[model samples]
Target: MAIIKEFMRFKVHMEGSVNCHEFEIEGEGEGHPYEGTQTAKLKVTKGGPLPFAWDILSPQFSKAYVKHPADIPDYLKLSFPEGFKWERVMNFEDGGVVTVTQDSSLQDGEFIYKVKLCGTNFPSDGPVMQKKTMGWFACSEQMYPEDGALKGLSKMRLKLKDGGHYDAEFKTTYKAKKPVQLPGAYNVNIKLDITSHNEDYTIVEQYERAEGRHS
Candidate 1:
């Protein structure tokens, strides 16, 4: 069994890399333009209720487009090693943060993670998530590159690591009202291993790749 860490900070973990393949048809179904996979690193930081206006800290990703690579902005690429501050800003529901409560276990140990959305603009009336479970790789109907540079990623998903025991594993889907911006609720499923015990109670990782028609 894995022990959950208290105030765990992922010291610049390589995180998980993603591979994506994309195919686009012209408005008239005439052309195929681009495709590629994007491998990225996620630096996560967690604390136990420190005195502050925010509760968590996460870095922002660069904007992505059809041909972009989702590059970690020069300002944010190596934040932790250099010492940076993270913040949690997803609006509160009547003062409570918007959260996805998840559970997982390994061996005989089990734990929970309360994930609050960050960097997402709430109170906006455009594209919003309709489901609580979703991922970035399987949500698209079109074959697209996981280049990390492009925007409009509607299927990306996150796995929270609370310790050696805490694992976030599930499958689900979500969709959007429009094709751009954010989509409506998709689907996702997760089976975790553990959380909140020692130095392993917190860290967030993302996994993605291309499927079908490719290896």
Candidate 2:
């Protein structure tokens, strides 16, 4: 039977302010059986004026892609008392890439790190693409170098033909397992939830996933 060995939560927030924002927030990450890069999108509505405003909130990631080492980034690398080693290399379609390699021996406990993104611009017509990426290394309770989990986050932007723009944030979480096992087969599913926002329930995309692994 498959079970959740450990779990971590990621909170998303807007970097700046909004004017009269109206858009949706949804994202996905690299999954166990399916290894893919993390991606996020902001769908904007164009029927008003120029330069639509936006502020991000209620962000969540699907659990499937949160477990792989290569899928996440390395903004925060935890150091063990004895030692540890970590490496990740990812290539993108548009010549964009992310690589991380860390090996060190240091302290233990919680460490908060902050990073910045330069932002990306997408074409008005065509499929949306990724911009900047980041990852964090979740060390094991024993603090072993090779034995730990990983978490990833990504940011992107899109502009509409009518001057409206959308900013998005994506994130995922994963745990470390011995024998270096990977999730075998799985299902990629999404759900929609309604919450009280402006006088009744508003429909929003709640991304979720389910998968199975093999040792």
Candidate 3:
């Protein structure tokens, strides 16, 4: 069994936001350079200082031509004391590429574009996750150092002490996204929930990510 605060409840209000910076990284093939970030502000909306760990899930990644799908395990380089807990229960139905071409007749020159579309009809239906079943360094302590910026973050055991004041950021190459070849689904939807045990649950907030193209 795991240690959990029996009376501690995470009535956290998570405000999630994502911003991407698209840059070109030329290489062997057609350089498809892309990167971005996803951040969540875990605000204790109503209650407690509980222990919460972050776990990344949803839409399995695979190797593709030019577009190399990545996860938090490989991309996250630096470390920060404040952390997050994300529940990504993806439902990628009615997804396809949508193209809107501008009139290239005479007035409009050649302005056309295409976008990967993932639609959500009744996106307000799902179980508010039972509990956080993983961690940043669940087994041991997974830590790496780009420099001595922060302390040895191997101790990223996030035991938030205050309410409405905790933040965790997800990054790729220090701040980025360029491609949108996620043939898997449409939206990478993650809900925020705080807990002390592996099966505890309380908060319910949805933070959206990977919404647009990144290549």
Candidate 4:
């Protein structure tokens, strides 16, 4: 119905080391703010990557990952004792020349070092530069068969170029009147071989930019 025809925005808040443009739009916004109710405040920042990827799953994450070793995240770092030789345990393909800090002398303590995302952009364009920020994925509502009372979102999945798949399950809040899942607010529990994530989003009620805003 018109519900499918009108504005449905989702305000994304990331749970991992990744982030991107802020809001995702499925339809045009009314532009006029909701009144007479406590309309939640939502801002329309540039949206994030359409599909998440690192250098190639989440590009925004790759951007964050370029930080210096000092600012490197705990997730990218591993602990090693002094005198440990750097060995290529995992193959790095395309991003940069960052490597394990090779120090022959040990202070006799565990030291922390960051792991860099490197490759020749083989899987894809490694950690892309933004011509402008935008949305890659659009969240949508899909109802179950005949019963029609069941409301939720359709499944969202991302297949990494590296042969990894990031599948997401969305649990959303709903509009009780007539009953429909609120695309603007939901919880996503994502799983993959290397990670488990829980993140949620809400609507951003601000200036509108729907068409041509995503890839």
Candidate 5:
């Protein structure tokens, strides 16, 4: 079915540090240490005629990442956070380092986001300019063969280049048809991790919530 909701554009201001508990994205390598301030403006458009899109408006880069969108790979498919069947729609490529955009609505319900990454030039050189964001969705309580009916999201598993991999394990939950304030509108929670790249590939960064409007 088409996701024909209205449109309630929301902005996400985020800032935090990334670390790791046990990260390795290539061939069971050793854990490494890295840190960075994760800041960005995530403008969200929900309840539109179709599934809204995510507009990453004029993202300013610091430390290492330059906020380049077109550089991102096309076949970049992401797994949902741990409960519903939510994933990102293909637009990032055409969006071209967009400062603002929307995401495709797979089913229906609330969607939350938690992004993490692991690569060769991470931390020191910053994440690959191409690989920087992670997306998540919190759908309405629906019937599932596995859990029956519940309010939660599936875990996000991202595969990186150089045979590397990462997982931003989920910890929070989003509900269906819920109402609250901006920023705290939907339910969201995420933990970052990198694994299997080589010797400096195991790290974890966790984000609980954003503080102000611009993070």
Candidate 6:
């Protein structure tokens, strides 16, 4: 609603990465800082994408906030050792990226660290941009379990290229292969595979992209 300025930033993590942004909207001009809470809501633009790519099955926000970066639950964090190689899949298409990092360590953790699906290099002409959706995938520390077992995020909120909102449901399965114990460290081996899928597409898109054909 009446967004004044937009700001965006990024942070890189040993296990993953972070992409964050927000819109500075029109705020009440003359008011005490401790006055009634100021609220910010997303303004959904009309006219958007069909047969949307994903839908979030669960009705909730999946993020967590912790007092310190290291204080973030271990289950929510993923780390890779030396010579570890991970791949990003292509399109019909499924498989996505997962980033693990702090919200804003420089800001004294005032803001919650979260994950969102954002459009890259979106067109600036006509209603093309409006058709795209960008929203939270998970909030700080919400994707894992108390025991920190091999769990995943199946429900996701997404914005499509058609100005539509969706609850994107998907699956992720992970396994630790060749895990090794190191001096004063654990799980040093980074040989593992993370498989994820969207409703219409599977994580095999990477293979399709390599062969230049539909699988």
Indicate which candidate wins on lDDT: 2
Tens digits of per-residue lDDT, candidate 5, 63-120, equal 0111112322111011121212222111222222111121212223322332222112
- Model 2 segments beyond 4 Å from truth? 1-11, 14-118, 121-125, 129-203
Question: All candidates' lDDT scores?
Answer: 0.21, 0.26, 0.19, 0.24, 0.22, 0.22
User: Which structure among the candidates has the greatest TM-score?
Assistant: 2
lDDT of 6 at 179: 36
lDDT of 2: 0.26
Model 2: ten consecutive residues of lowest lDDT: 135-144
lDDT of 1 by residue, 88-177 (tens): 222323122222221111122211112223223222321222112122222232223222221222222232222111112221121211
| Residues 25-125, model 3: lDDT tens digits | 11011111122212222322222222222222211110011111453222211111111111122222212111111110111211111111121232233
Query: Candidate 2's error at 80, in angstroms?
Result: 18
TM-score of model 1 vs. true structure = 0.21
| Pick by lDDT: 4 or 5, better one | 4
lDDT of 6 by residue, 1-215 (tens): 21111221112122111112221111011111111111111111121112222222111111111111233222211221111122121111223333221221212212222222332232333122332443334421113222222333344445555565444333332222223221111121111111233332221111000000111
Candidate 1 Cα lDDT to native: 0.21
- The segments of candidate 4 whose C-alpha lies over 4 angstroms from its true place after superposition are 1-150, 176-215
Residue pairs in collision within model 2: 30-65, 31-65, 66-173, 73-135, 74-135, 84-145
RMSD of each: 19.0, 13.1, 20.4, 21.1, 19.6, 17.1
Error of 1 at 49 (Å): 9.7
Q: Show the lowest summed lDDT stretch of 10 residues, model 3.
A: 23-32
CA shift of 89, model 6, Å = 12
Candidate 4 TM-score, true structure as reference: 0.21
TM-score of 2: 0.25
Write down the TM-score of every candidate.
0.21, 0.25, 0.17, 0.21, 0.23, 0.25
The stretch of ten residues in a row with the least summed lDDT in candidate 5 is: 24-33
Using lDDT as the yardstick, the better of models 1 and 3 is: 1
